[PDB]
From a paper:
The three-dimensional structures of BT3130 and BT3965 both reveal a two-domain enzyme that appears to be well conserved with published examples of GH92 α-mannosidases. Indeed, quantitative structural comparison using the DALI server shows that the three-dimensional structures of BT3130 and BT3965 have high similarity, with an r.m.s.d. of 1.4 Å mapped over 738 matched Cα positions (sequence identity = 40%, Z-score = 48.7). Like the members of the exo-α-mannosidase families GH38 and GH47, GH92 enzymes are metal-dependent, and a single calcium ion is observed coordinated within the active sites of both BT3130 and BT3965. Interestingly, however, while Ca2+ derived from the bacterial expression host was consistently observed within previous structures of BT3990, both BT3130 and BT3965 showed a somewhat reduced ability to bind and sequester this required divalent cation. Within BT3130, the 580-loop is positioned lower, and projects into the +1 subsite at a steeper angle, leaving a larger solvent-exposed space at the outer surface of the substrate-binding cavity. Furthermore, the hydrophobic ‘roof’ of this subsite is contributed by Trp67 (rather than Trp88 as in BT3990) and appears shifted some 2.5 Å towards the outer surface. BT3130 and BT3965 are found together within the same clade, and are distinct from previously published structures of the α-1,2-specific enzymes BT3990 and BT2199.
Structural analyses of two glycoside hydrolase family 92 α-mannosidases, BT3130 and BT3965, together with mechanistically relevant complexes at 1.8–2.5 Å resolution reveal conservation of the global enzyme fold and core catalytic apparatus despite different linkage specificities. Most enzymes within family GH92 are exo-acting α-mannosidases that are capable of hydrolysing terminal mannosidic residues with a variety of linkages, including α-1,2, α-1,3, α-1,4 and α-1,6 glycosidic bonds. Complementary to α-mannosidases within largely eukaryotic mannosidase families (particularly GH38 and GH47) that play important roles in N-glycan processing, GH92 enzymes are metal-dependent, featuring a single Ca2+ ion coordinated within the catalytic active site. GH92 enzymes act via a classic single-displacement mechanism, leading to inverted configuration at the anomeric centre.
Residue numbers in the entry:
A (entry chain A), B (entry chain A): 19 to 576, 579 to 735
The structure:
Amino acid sequence: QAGEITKYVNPFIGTGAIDGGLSGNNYPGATSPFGMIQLSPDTSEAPNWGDASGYDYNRNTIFGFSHTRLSGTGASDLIDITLMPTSSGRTSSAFTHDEEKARPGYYQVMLKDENINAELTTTQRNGIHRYQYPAGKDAEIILDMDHSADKGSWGRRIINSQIRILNDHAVEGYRIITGWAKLRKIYFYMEFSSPILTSTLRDGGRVHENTAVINGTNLHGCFRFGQLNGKPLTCKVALSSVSMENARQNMEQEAPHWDFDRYVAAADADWEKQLGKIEVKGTEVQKEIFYTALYHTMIQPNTMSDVNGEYMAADYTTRKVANNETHYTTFSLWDTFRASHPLYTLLEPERVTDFVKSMIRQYEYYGYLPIWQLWGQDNYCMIGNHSIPVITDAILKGIPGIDMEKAYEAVYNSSVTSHPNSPFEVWEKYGFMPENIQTQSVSITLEQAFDDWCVAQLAAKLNKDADYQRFHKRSEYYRNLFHPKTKFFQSKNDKGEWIEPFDPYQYGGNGGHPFTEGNAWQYFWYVPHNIQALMELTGGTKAFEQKLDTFFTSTYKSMNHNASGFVGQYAHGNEPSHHVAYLYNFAGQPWKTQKYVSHILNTLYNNTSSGYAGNDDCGQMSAWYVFSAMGFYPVNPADGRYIIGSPLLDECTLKLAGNKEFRIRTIRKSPEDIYIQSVTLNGKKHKDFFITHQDIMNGGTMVFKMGKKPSGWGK
Amino acid sequence: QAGEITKYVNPFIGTGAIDGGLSGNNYPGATSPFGMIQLSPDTSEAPNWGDASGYDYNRNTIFGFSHTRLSGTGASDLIDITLMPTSSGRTSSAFTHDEEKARPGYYQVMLKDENINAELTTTQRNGIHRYQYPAGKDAEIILDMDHSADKGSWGRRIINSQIRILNDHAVEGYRIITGWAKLRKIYFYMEFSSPILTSTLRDGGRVHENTAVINGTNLHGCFRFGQLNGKPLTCKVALSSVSMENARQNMEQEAPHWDFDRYVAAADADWEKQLGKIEVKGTEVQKEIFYTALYHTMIQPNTMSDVNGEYMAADYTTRKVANNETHYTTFSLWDTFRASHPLYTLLEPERVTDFVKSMIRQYEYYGYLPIWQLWGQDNYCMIGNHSIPVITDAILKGIPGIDMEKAYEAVYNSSVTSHPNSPFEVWEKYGFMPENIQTQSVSITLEQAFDDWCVAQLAAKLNKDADYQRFHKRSEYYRNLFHPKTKFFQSKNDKGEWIEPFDPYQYGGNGGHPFTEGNAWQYFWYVPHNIQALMELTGGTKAFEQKLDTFFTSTYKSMNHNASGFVGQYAHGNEPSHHVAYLYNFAGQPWKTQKYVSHILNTLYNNTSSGYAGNDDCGQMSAWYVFSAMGFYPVNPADGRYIIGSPLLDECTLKLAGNKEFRIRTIRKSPEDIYIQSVTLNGKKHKDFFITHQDIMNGGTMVFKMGKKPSGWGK
Ligand SMILES: [Ca+2]
Ligand SMILES: [Ca+2]
């Protein structure tokens, strides 16, 4: 049954916002799993934070089809190498959603101004286009090398670029550009299925007719093919971070032929194998939401090395991975360490080895592990050193092919070598970040303490007992900001005094406040490695339960743009809250976890363009759905335990390595049955409120008996 | 006799200006012939156009010793990797010229604030330092990665950089920076002869004590070695355009040992072999001026490829030359095609093969040959496509190892593929550049017509007869701007009308005027490939002679900063005039050439800091002296003829390939004997006013009979 699973993915979920609500910043264009190429229309001349992927569902004009982007980020970048079909040298066109389709590996739209049909597909490193022009009209392609994310942010400018016509069917070039990533070099090689008859190249006002090459900072091409009289024009475009030669080789290996439908079909088969890793059973809407979410987790991290292994490293030099390896980038770690990376350990252990290796390369050539990585380099966005949980998690779980001593070097040195937002001599001297020395101090203290717990766990695994003590002590530094009267984590200055005045509802931004894109209410819960300690500090399990109740019911509104989708003070759009609904289990009240998780799944996710309660954040919003719908969530994303919530779907099957399955099953009378009555794992009654990574990866079956009313299970 | 020739070089010639006069923009620090490293003190925090090499003789403060620069340019760039010795973390110091020495491959200065002695030398790709601290004082080195040319020009900013301490004796890093060259990557590897005891790294206000690495845009290091108590600190620094690994390898191969005096001695031996290629006899002052000029021609073009052959190409990718090859850059072509490159065909034919190959690489990866090349890429400074005369000249003269068909491809395509300041479809449609379509139109028309003559000559050599006609016709386009009433070359618009009003004294700049850094009086003479045509147009030899007389005696003053050193309207500081004193030969009055050449040599060159009548322009001012002092000059620098002037020196011997000499000899009673009475070449009386390249390269002897009064020779 071809398209059995892929037919459920709706790439328009998360591409817009309804009224003035919240968008995922997802894109509907074609891509391949963990690919280099995201071939998609831009509905803006210059993508910005409100439409960072390049597309907005509320818009009606397409300004070209570019080949790279981020999914669900709060800042725009990439947007490289932009083609537009036309008959009269035009650069934009109207379109309607009524004449537009999208599915895994495929996008189509009718461009209405000149009645030209556009279809897109991809391979791992190539974009394939097919354009159908009216019979009797001239066929032309415009290449725009200036089109990019907004040039008024990040000091973004094109340093240099080239367009070069090699023969009548081939064009190469490149651009070097600054932005959110400090410096990116994007090389291309392009071919046409019909010969170029005439052409024009320009750089701003400087125009050159039928000229084989141009160099500059504001380049544009127009290639004219004449009357095609019903033959569609097929275009192929390969990219590289290193060279035009590599891009050409990427095309020779992955995309040598000219059969468009064959490319489309392979892309669909590829997505069917990927999405097939979790087979689910539920309503038609739930399958659409679930498979679309699973898709969003699998469109990055992005392939960066070429088919010959070469890539631009973090010291801006050209290097090569081994034959069986792939260098990846796009690591939105402040979001993705929480759920996306745990999800990859279940579904993509072979890729996780390459992700870890890619992170370690930043250490090897830049001096510390990635904080937030984009086009092979760090941009320091957000806080923490959250490569560390990801590398730790992979090693403790036994993901194969990782050099452990080298990984520990990287992790250790990243934790003792001070760098922006990590003053480690301040850290160990005070036992916290003082707000007057390091801003975002309370968020950093909580998140960094968690990173240190991870280092400790890795030290213990390698019998490095002195290191263990050092990092274990550091992991307990959250205590130094716990205020004993108010029972919030609050900021202190270097004299050890509590900053006055303090309001736990007050949102901070990305500096000038002790919290990062949230308030003290939301950050209170961030001790994922020692919830028992946190419970004790709050005044015991009963006290901790009541504080959670206040958190989930208190509707006061002070503000920050990123935090949205509210259940009291709980904002599902920002990921400090994401683990919190699972904390009622720890308090002795699992039914409350089941209640709130079910509320969020049913109420804050949907199958319209709005889709999500905030930016998808490289699929972290989606990974939350994937996990929670299956019925468990990695509260501590480095301890290899998944905390039970409430399974949404009737059944899920995880297709694992190799010949193995983890089968999740439900006994229910209706969808109102959201409370767990009991759980069985491999025939034995299951008394804990978690399952382990080993429980899943061994293969087996887990059965949930559900009911309409709270049971008493784990109570 | 060690230092027989090197003792004559005075690196302070051209480093200053006296009253408000004119400087060469030369530098006194250490370098090697055609090297990668120019290790020299900067007397400014941020070098600008008034001190573009980094040093000014009128200054009394040193702000560090950097490792790269240009010699004699009108804009600053490079200035990379800056060390400063100190005992108390200081960044600047007073010095006096009384306690400062310099000679080929060596610089020394006493830094007076803390009484520290600095000595510098180089290899091809390494800089070697030796610092002597007072006994009883702490030894420290500051590394400054922000120090550069003025950041308010060219949009210059550091994109990213690194300092990284590898062990107690080794530091690596890099910087990526924009400027006059669009994008440069400079990687380094450094070692110390004593172990680092403590250290600090910072990025702006962010300071990290005893921390092994830092990344950012404004980086500074301080390394502390303790009390050395009389042991000098030796530092070694290698560079690369590609990687830290390559830089380290450059040090392993060229500079593995720790004997400073041995490095100094090899640098001096290397310079003695180079300067020894012309052995001269004259007064002590003339030998100082001559050998210093010869030195200035040999400090660039600069080595860019590492010892493994790797280099950054003009498409910003990493490539590799063959084993026996070297990739070079720093091609100040608008100046250097005139005399410097002709000089290299006599003295450096083996290097010229590599220069030509390096130029062709820009064509291969960027689409046309270099106009003005800097750190492996074009910056378009000035006008013309003046790689073309250089490549043409080398091929016609039979410089070996140049692929001629590939070279012709590069030359041809660079002459028909339009690009900035070369609208070739405008060129062939109008038979000139119309000022209202292309500015600097008269200068471009004259200089481009000369480039086209060169292409024609190359076409004829390869029996490409259609091409010959095309480019020969183009070479005659100077005629289309010759005004028949006024007898100047003047600007026209696209309707073919002469622009009114027109003043032949009025200087233009680099746009908005039809002349480039000069007036119509100075550009009038630029038809070096058809002086007979120019003579006819002026009204015959008598008329042409009289126009030259007016040019050399008319003292009116309107203005431009670059044009200076005046003999009437003749300005020796700018190179459009440079061939003009030799034109009296063509008019039938060689004594007048001999008079004016002798005046310029004796009056506009000197052995003080001012030194030259304008910027040295990568040794073009110096190459003029070298040629003219020997007694001939390449008026047409692609026809292989050297036009006779007046020999200044008693004797010169050119030491050629191999076992061959060209011996130039004079019969004279005193230095007042400046007029040529007769000339002998290989025993036969020499009736022409030129000698050929073959006459010189075959070896032989040329004798000038001189006298106090004009003779009648060639009259
Ligand atoms: Ca978010
Ligand atoms: Ca000049």
